[PDB]
Every structure is written in structure tokens, then in C-alpha cells.
Amino acid sequence: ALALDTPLPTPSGWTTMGDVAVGDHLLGPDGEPTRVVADTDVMLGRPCYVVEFSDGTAIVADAQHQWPTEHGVRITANLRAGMHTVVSPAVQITAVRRRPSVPVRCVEVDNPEHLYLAGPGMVPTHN
């Protein structure tokens, strides 16, 4: 679900969606370590999007990647400018557009909100 070069913060620093492994730790919605308990393979040919945020960062995600908004969970294909990604100043989605397909990959974490931080802005996103 996220492009492989997406940076993801960890308790030791940074990894990428391309490098993170089951058993590694990401950061949960409160910044605390959260364990990666499952993943996908690298997936090809999926329809991809750029999501641009108000903190000046951007994440490439596939159509079906899930985001926690003020309106509940929304997939990338349903995001619209003006929404925010929240965990309960929430960063705001400034733009969403299609982009040519790149390899993507998803992971699952084990905190009860099923959220991890993504991108250089540490934006909340849903497993």
C-alpha cells in the first residue's frame, strides 16, 4: 500500500516501507514503539496516488491504502483536499492526484488503533 521509498520512523531512527520487516518496530499514534506483526510482498501494477499534506510532506500510496480522517477511515481513492489525518494541530491533506504505478507494500502493527507514523512528517496512517 505505500511506495517503497516512503520513510517510516522507528525507535532507533528511520527505515523505509521497502526495508521494514515483521518483528521490527515502527511508531504508533502516540509516538511509542509498535510492533510490525504482518506484511505484504512488494506489489506491482497497483494504481498509485500522491497525497500532499499541509506540513510540506507527501506520501505515495495505492488506491486502497487506508487513512484515519475526521470522517472515519477513508481509502486513498476517496481522500479529498481539506480532510485531516487524525489519531482521536492535525495535519491537513492539501492535494490528492494519480501518479504512475510504483511498487508498494503494506504492514500491520499491533496497537489498538492500528496506526503507524509515515513520511518525514510522521503523519498517522492506518495499517
Numbering used by the authors: 1 to 88, 101 to 139
Task: Give excerpts from the publication.
To understand the mechanism of disulfide bond formation, a crystal structure of the class 3 DnaBi1 intein was solved to 1.95 Å resolution. Class 3 inteins have several unique attributes, most notably three highly conserved residues in splicing blocks B, F, and G, termed the WCT triplet, that characterizes this class. This structure displayed the classic intein shape, with the β-strand fold indicative of the Hedgehog/Intein (HINT) domain. This internal cysteine (Cys118 for DnaBi1) attacks the N-extein–intein junction (step 1), akin to Cys1 of class 1 inteins. Catalytic Cys118 is centrally positioned in the active site (left), allowing interactions with both splice junctions. One of the three DnaBi1 molecules within the asymmetric unit, chain B, showed the thiol sidechain of Cys118 adopting two distinct conformations, a and b. Conformation a of Cys118 has 36% occupancy and is the unique orientation for this structure, while conformation b has 64% occupancy and is representative of the Cys118 orientation in the two other molecules in the asymmetric unit. The thiol sidechains for both residues also rotate inward towards each other. This modeling suggests that subtle conformational shifts can bring the cysteines within proximity and implies that the β-strand containing Cys48 is likely responsible for closing that distance.
DnaB is the replicative helicase in bacteria and an essential component of the replication machinery. The two inteins in the dnaB gene of M. smegmatis (Msm) are different from each other in sequence, insertion site, and splicing mechanism.
